[PDB]
Design a protein around this ligand. Structure first.
Ligand SMILES: *[C@@H]1O[C@H](CO)[C@@H](O)[C@H](O)[C@H]1NC(C)=O
Ligand SMILES: *[C@@H]1O[C@H](CO)[C@@H](O)[C@H](O)[C@H]1NC(C)=O
Ligand SMILES: *[C@@H]1O[C@H](CO)[C@@H](O)[C@H](O)[C@H]1NC(C)=O
Lengths: 32, 171, 96
């Protein structure tokens, strides 16, 4: 009787950049 | 492939659960579904679109380069114009790129804190009537069916209702 | 420690990379009947220097708080990792 908590995924290859790490794969991203 | 939930004790995401950004996964004797926690997904989406719209709004008053022409005895003024326009384009390029970097890390930390806050909400509701398995799961100690599953997913879990079987099952 | 040092060196390197295209002051000369344009040049160069000084100093301030909170979150995530695996076999003493 587990009620495990988690999050959503795809197989997407959308990549963003942050301050401390590049090539960050994300579920959803918006090119601007 | 800051907060410690996304790529933390919860090791990976769930491909099957596509209704929301965050949700649950119950596995009882009556079935095994992949539900989504609303009013957390909607709050996250509202915050993310609000952040994006603020990034669009703050950049409306950028610098617009216009074409100014000068002759061969106006080379200092031409150099001044070139340096002014290029410096303003460099300033706004730095502003856009650096704002994208900070708000990207803030968005990732926001999703992480949302997942950890959902985890802590379930932890503070179940209390001792469950068992933290360490990966984000709560193995229930009493007999929990869909009726208490929806109350865990709601926020209306009733702690005094279920305490007899947990003590007996422990050794 | 490896992830932390990779993160801080990546942060520092992105700080260096974003500031390659700053403003470079170039010396331009004007005569005594070109004092308005001389003032315009002085104000432009000084305003761009002020803008990039503000950018560098403020970025240093934010990234310093982010680095300190990153080290703090790394220590707390190690503590929470050890608590999660130990379960009830151990006992939190409060000090860590
Ligand atoms: C990832 O970022 C690096 C810079 O570190 C860049 O060279 C590379 O092209 C990026 N990856 C992809 C798949 O574009
Ligand atoms: C992943 O997110 C993308 C956008 O990057 C979206 O189109 C998609 O529905 C999600 N799922 C899959 C299976 O690609
Ligand atoms: C959960 O909330 C919904 C919406 O208010 C309600 O219809 C449902 O009965 C609730 N479930 C429980 C177990 O209280």
């Amino acid at each position: 009787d587990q009620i495990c908590i988690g999050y959503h995924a795809n197989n997407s290859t959308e990549q963003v950049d942050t301050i401390m790490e590049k090539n960050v794969t994300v579920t959803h991203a918006q090119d601007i | 492939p800051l907060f410690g939930a996304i790529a933390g004790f919860i090791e990976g995401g769930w491909q099957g659960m596509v209704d929301g950004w965050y949700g649950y996964h119950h596995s009882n004797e009556q079935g095994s579904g992949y539900a989504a926690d609303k009013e957390s997904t909607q709050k996250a989406i509202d915050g993310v679109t609000n952040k994006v719209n603020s990034i669009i709004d703050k950049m409306n008053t950028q610098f617009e380069a216009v074409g100014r022409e000068f002759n061969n005895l106006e080379r200092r003024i031409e150099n001044l114009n070139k340096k002014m326009e290029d410096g303003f384009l460099d300033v706004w390029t730095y502003n856009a790129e650096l704002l994208v970097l900070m708000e990207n890390e803030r968005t990732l930390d926001f999703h992480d804190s949302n997942v950890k806050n959902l985890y802590d909400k379930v932890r503070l509701q179940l209390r001792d009537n469950a068992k933290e398995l360490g990966n984000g799961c709560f193995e229930f100690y009493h007999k929990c069916d869909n009726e208490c599953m929806e109350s865990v997913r709601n926020g209306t879990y009733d702690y005094p209702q279920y305490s007899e079987e947990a003590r007996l099952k422990r050794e």
